[PDB]
């Protein structure tokens, strides 16, 4: 049900990115309004897909999908492996592990058992910040008649 | 023609400030990457 909209939003994603490809395929870049508009459409599609994806994360994890005997697997085999490859691209996983290394908390603090207190401090600073924004947003506010004259110049009546 | 500068300029100010507060309230809370690009776009 949700993927019926996922395929449409990803279709508009492919169309938008293809339009950006056509705009960038020229020698000189055209106007920036169309570029920024297509980029906003792309971001809207990505956010629209991630929202419904995160909304239905418990249902998709409660089912398995694998092809039926009605499948030409005797001729092509690697393609069927590509269609159901859970393994991410080595760039997203590689830079994902690198970012995990450049996050300020590693597994050495997992051994120390100490994360919920830092999260609590974070949320507290969210409260303080939102209060400061409450105050700082509470500081400011957001002659005559031409026909009669000519009638005098031609007849002399007042 | 000055009223277009009133409405337009004031709208840019409200989008700047309010969008800035929305920014700071979204920096503090693949969801993480979508937060990266939403913050960057703001």
């Amino acid at each position: 049900q949700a993927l019926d909209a996922v395929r449409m939003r990803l279709a508009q994603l492919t169309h938008s990115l293809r339009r950006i490809r056509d705009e960038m395929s020229k020698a000189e870049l055209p106007q920036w309004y169309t570029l920024q508009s297509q980029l906003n459409v792309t971001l809207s599609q990505l956010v629209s897909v991630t929202s419904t994806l995160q909304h239905f994360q418990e249902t998709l994890d409660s089912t398995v999908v694998y092809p039926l005997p009605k499948f030409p697997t005797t001729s092509h085999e690697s393609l069927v492996t590509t269609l159901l490859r859970k393994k991410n691209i080595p760039e997203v996983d590689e830079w994902m592990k690198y970012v995990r290394e450049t996050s300020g908390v590693t597994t050495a603090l997992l051994k120390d058992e100490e994360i919920e207190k830092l999260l609590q401090q974070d949320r507290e600073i969210t409260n303080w910040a939102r209060t400061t924004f409450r105050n700082e947003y509470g500081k400011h506010d957001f002659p005559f008649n031409v026909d009669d004259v000519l009638k005098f110049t031609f007849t002399g009546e007042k | 023609s000055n009223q277009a500068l009133y409405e337009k300029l004031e709208q840019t100010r409200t989008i700047l400030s309010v969008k800035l507060a929305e920014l700071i309230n979204m920096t503090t809370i693949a969801v993480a990457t979508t937060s990266v690009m939403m913050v960057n776009n703001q």
Binding site: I20, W32, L39, L46, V92, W95 | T33, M37, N40
Partner: peptide
Amino acid sequence: SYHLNSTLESLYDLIEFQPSQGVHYK
């Protein structure tokens, strides 16, 4: 997402800011 980020940076490297002419692309 990451690829889009790449494009989003590259275009921002070619922005010419003018108060009377707007944004140009060198």
